[PDB]
Amino acid sequence: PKEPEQLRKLFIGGLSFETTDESLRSHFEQWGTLTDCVVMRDPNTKRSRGFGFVTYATVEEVDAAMNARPHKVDGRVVEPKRAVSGAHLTVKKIFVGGIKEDTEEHHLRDYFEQYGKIEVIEIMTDRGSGKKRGFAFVTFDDHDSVDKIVIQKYHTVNGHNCEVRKAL
Ligand SMILES: CC(C)N1CCN(C(=O)c2cccs2)CC1
Ligand SMILES: CC(C)N1CCN(C(=O)c2cccs2)CC1
């Protein structure tokens, strides 16, 4: 059973205009089997549009590629991002709801630290009473953590089924 193709794709921005399907593939095949690899080009001039995409055989291979950033492809540092879940909302912060009053910082840290490096955990409290409001924000050092988090169907933290969204 293969993972949905959308979850196996990486949009690669910032390409050198000299990058080709072949050189993009030769680069990204270091981290997994590529089922597709395309440089976007103008339909008339064939000049590169400066971005492209690669599709790996598995999600674990996407993770491997993202963990190997920064990627310097044909002399230029590129910007890989997972496919949208059609514009990417590139953020480093999530809202975590449904955590009730008994969820503490270590619950959120022990879970979310496996998605990425955490910089801030903010457990929301009531401005008047100080009581926990049942939601939190987690800020990571990089957007890929958030991208991995929000495409999961479920998040279980401190026994609670949590609702997690990108936060601006
Ligand atoms: C066959 C399947 C159950 N394998 C279990 C391990 N595995 C992962 O842990 C993944 C990590 C990131 C996304 S997939 C997918 C491969
Ligand atoms: C066709 C082209 C102009 N689109 C603009 C760039 N784009 C994104 O913002 C991304 C999607 C997923 C990760 S990046 C999608 C492609």
Side-chain angles (χ1 to χ4, degrees), residues 11 40 49 51 81-84 86-88:
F11 152 97
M40 296 294 297
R49 290 173 67 181
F51 68 98
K81 296 168 166 193
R82 290 176 205 249
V84 297
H88 196 266

mmCIF file of all heavy atoms in Angstrom, residues 11 40 49 51 81-84 86-88, ligand 2:
data_model
loop_
_atom_site.group_PDB
_atom_site.id
_atom_site.type_symbol
_atom_site.label_atom_id
_atom_site.label_comp_id
_atom_site.label_asym_id
_atom_site.label_seq_id
_atom_site.Cartn_x
_atom_site.Cartn_y
_atom_site.Cartn_z
ATOM 1 N N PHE A 11 8.206 20.257 -3.575
ATOM 2 C CA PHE A 11 8.335 21.397 -4.517
ATOM 3 C C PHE A 11 9.701 21.987 -4.247
ATOM 4 O O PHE A 11 10.096 22.035 -3.088
ATOM 5 C CB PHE A 11 7.258 22.446 -4.230
ATOM 6 C CG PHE A 11 7.636 23.873 -4.617
ATOM 7 C CD1 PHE A 11 7.220 24.408 -5.829
ATOM 8 C CD2 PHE A 11 8.387 24.684 -3.768
ATOM 9 C CE1 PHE A 11 7.559 25.704 -6.184
ATOM 10 C CE2 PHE A 11 8.721 25.976 -4.129
ATOM 11 C CZ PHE A 11 8.308 26.480 -5.337
ATOM 12 N N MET A 40 10.227 22.872 -14.082
ATOM 13 C CA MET A 40 9.227 23.647 -14.812
ATOM 14 C C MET A 40 9.888 24.631 -15.760
ATOM 15 O O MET A 40 10.816 25.350 -15.375
ATOM 16 C CB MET A 40 8.344 24.399 -13.824
ATOM 17 C CG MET A 40 7.515 23.516 -12.919
ATOM 18 S SD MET A 40 6.287 22.608 -13.883
ATOM 19 C CE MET A 40 5.354 24.022 -14.471
ATOM 20 N N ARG A 49 11.696 28.018 -15.364
ATOM 21 C CA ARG A 49 10.931 28.879 -14.473
ATOM 22 C C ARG A 49 11.555 28.967 -13.081
ATOM 23 O O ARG A 49 11.039 29.690 -12.221
ATOM 24 C CB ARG A 49 9.473 28.398 -14.406
ATOM 25 C CG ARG A 49 8.678 28.654 -15.740
ATOM 26 C CD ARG A 49 7.274 28.008 -15.734
ATOM 27 N NE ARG A 49 6.391 28.628 -14.760
ATOM 28 C CZ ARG A 49 5.132 28.267 -14.526
ATOM 29 N NH1 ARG A 49 4.556 27.294 -15.205
ATOM 30 N NH2 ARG A 49 4.432 28.913 -13.592
ATOM 31 N N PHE A 51 11.890 26.629 -10.765
ATOM 32 C CA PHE A 51 11.371 25.712 -9.731
ATOM 33 C C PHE A 51 11.012 24.417 -10.410
ATOM 34 O O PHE A 51 10.911 24.333 -11.633
ATOM 35 C CB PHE A 51 10.184 26.289 -8.933
ATOM 36 C CG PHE A 51 8.900 26.463 -9.735
ATOM 37 C CD1 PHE A 51 7.893 25.510 -9.687
ATOM 38 C CD2 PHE A 51 8.703 27.584 -10.528
ATOM 39 C CE1 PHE A 51 6.724 25.680 -10.408
ATOM 40 C CE2 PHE A 51 7.531 27.745 -11.247
ATOM 41 C CZ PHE A 51 6.553 26.789 -11.193
ATOM 42 N N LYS A 81 9.965 22.225 -0.243
ATOM 43 C CA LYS A 81 8.799 22.268 0.627
ATOM 44 C C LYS A 81 7.868 21.132 0.234
ATOM 45 O O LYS A 81 7.738 20.812 -0.946
ATOM 46 C CB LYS A 81 8.015 23.573 0.463
ATOM 47 C CG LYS A 81 8.770 24.826 0.863
ATOM 48 C CD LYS A 81 8.002 26.049 0.380
ATOM 49 C CE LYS A 81 8.490 27.331 1.026
ATOM 50 N NZ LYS A 81 7.527 28.438 0.762
ATOM 51 N N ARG A 82 7.224 20.520 1.214
ATOM 52 C CA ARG A 82 6.226 19.518 0.888
ATOM 53 C C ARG A 82 5.037 20.173 0.184
ATOM 54 O O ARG A 82 4.781 21.373 0.320
ATOM 55 C CB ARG A 82 5.765 18.833 2.168
ATOM 56 C CG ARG A 82 6.836 17.967 2.765
ATOM 57 C CD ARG A 82 6.406 17.357 4.103
ATOM 58 N NE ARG A 82 7.596 17.069 4.885
ATOM 59 C CZ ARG A 82 8.051 15.856 5.169
ATOM 60 N NH1 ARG A 82 7.372 14.761 4.846
ATOM 61 N NH2 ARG A 82 9.212 15.737 5.813
ATOM 62 N N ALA A 83 4.314 19.358 -0.583
ATOM 63 C CA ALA A 83 3.164 19.825 -1.341
ATOM 64 C C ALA A 83 2.085 20.363 -0.409
ATOM 65 O O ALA A 83 2.012 20.013 0.770
ATOM 66 C CB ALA A 83 2.577 18.673 -2.156
ATOM 67 N N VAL A 84 1.230 21.227 -0.962
ATOM 68 C CA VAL A 84 0.200 21.872 -0.157
ATOM 69 C C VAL A 84 -0.863 20.861 0.262
ATOM 70 O O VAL A 84 -1.142 19.874 -0.439
ATOM 71 C CB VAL A 84 -0.438 23.062 -0.897
ATOM 72 C CG1 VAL A 84 0.590 24.149 -1.161
ATOM 73 C CG2 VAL A 84 -1.078 22.590 -2.178
ATOM 74 N N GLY A 86 -3.558 26.484 -3.734
ATOM 75 C CA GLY A 86 -2.343 25.815 -4.165
ATOM 76 C C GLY A 86 -1.071 26.559 -3.802
ATOM 77 O O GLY A 86 -0.002 26.269 -4.338
ATOM 78 N N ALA A 87 -1.189 27.521 -2.889
ATOM 79 C CA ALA A 87 -0.043 28.244 -2.354
ATOM 80 C C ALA A 87 0.327 27.678 -0.990
ATOM 81 O O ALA A 87 -0.550 27.358 -0.182
ATOM 82 C CB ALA A 87 -0.364 29.733 -2.211
ATOM 83 N N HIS A 88 1.630 27.551 -0.738
ATOM 84 C CA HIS A 88 2.101 27.044 0.544
ATOM 85 C C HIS A 88 2.042 28.150 1.588
ATOM 86 O O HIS A 88 2.504 29.272 1.348
ATOM 87 C CB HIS A 88 3.543 26.551 0.428
ATOM 88 C CG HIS A 88 3.974 25.670 1.564
ATOM 89 N ND1 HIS A 88 4.630 26.157 2.677
ATOM 90 C CD2 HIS A 88 3.887 24.329 1.737
ATOM 91 C CE1 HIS A 88 4.899 25.157 3.499
ATOM 92 N NE2 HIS A 88 4.470 24.037 2.947
HETATM 93 C C1 LIG B 2 2.740 26.623 -10.314
HETATM 94 C C2 LIG B 2 3.460 27.522 -9.332
HETATM 95 C C3 LIG B 2 3.414 28.980 -9.746
HETATM 96 N N1 LIG B 2 3.009 27.307 -7.938
HETATM 97 C C4 LIG B 2 3.500 28.340 -7.028
HETATM 98 C C5 LIG B 2 4.413 27.772 -5.963
HETATM 99 N N2 LIG B 2 3.708 26.759 -5.177
HETATM 100 C C6 LIG B 2 3.772 26.723 -3.833
HETATM 101 O O1 LIG B 2 3.651 27.729 -3.140
HETATM 102 C C7 LIG B 2 4.035 25.470 -3.207
HETATM 103 C C8 LIG B 2 3.224 24.354 -3.157
HETATM 104 C C9 LIG B 2 3.759 23.367 -2.294
HETATM 105 C C10 LIG B 2 4.915 23.737 -1.718
HETATM 106 S S1 LIG B 2 5.501 25.201 -2.347
HETATM 107 C C11 LIG B 2 2.971 25.808 -6.008
HETATM 108 C C12 LIG B 2 3.384 25.983 -7.450
#
